[PDB]
Amino acid sequence: IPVRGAAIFNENLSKILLVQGTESDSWSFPRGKISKDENDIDCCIREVKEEIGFDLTDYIDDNQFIERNIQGKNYKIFLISGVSEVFNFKPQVRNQIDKIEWFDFKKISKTMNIKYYLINSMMRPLSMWLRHQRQIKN
């Protein structure tokens, strides 16, 4: 039942990488259900690797995340930066997701043309985290 995933930002903290699943047209964080034989990090790493072909092992920080209980499910979304915009993202299995695209992060706030899921309700802490990262890395 618990879900783990990642908010994956590019190097200059201006874009976020979102995916659209096979079951709907909304864009959200790459993520998946936790298996009984794994912890929060291993779930995130495994699911993101399957969805976008990128290994977060050396990017993930187990103390940087947003956890929200939404609609009967527990979400824990790890906060990631420094991921290359030119990496050739591709799912390990073709049906793990439908699409993978970068989004301009500041522009997402426009919504509520494009449907989002989870990210809009996390917009406040996500934005605060990002702006703080932007101070650190100057």
Curated annotation (Swiss-Prot):
Motif, Nudix box: chain positions: 32-53
Reported phenotype of the disruption mutant: Increases autophagy activity through accumulation of autophagy-related proteins in nutrient-replete conditions.
Subcellular location: Cytoplasm, P-body
Domain of life: Eukaryota
Domain called Nudix hydrolase: residue spans: 1-123
Phosphoserine modified-residue sites: 14
Residues reported in the UniProt entry to bind Mn(2+): 47, 51
Miscellaneous comment: Present with 8530 molecules/cell in log phase SD medium.
Family classification: Belongs to the Nudix hydrolase family. DCP2 subfamily.
Job description of the protein: Catalytic component of the decapping complex necessary for the degradation of mRNAs, both in normal mRNA turnover and in nonsense-mediated mRNA decay. Removes the 7-methyl guanine cap structure from mRNA molecules, yielding a 5'-phosphorylated mRNA fragment and 7m-GDP. Decapping is the major pathway of mRNA degradation in yeast and occurs through deadenylation, decapping and subsequent 5' to 3' exonucleolytic decay of the transcript body. Blocks autophagy in nutrient-rich conditions by repressing the expression of ATG-related genes through degradation of their transcripts.
Description of how the protein assembles with itself and partners: Component of the decapping complex composed of DCP1 and DCP2. Interacts with mRNA, LSM2, LSM4 and LSM8. Interacts with EDC3.
Protein name: m7GpppN-mRNA hydrolase
Gene behind the chain: DCP2
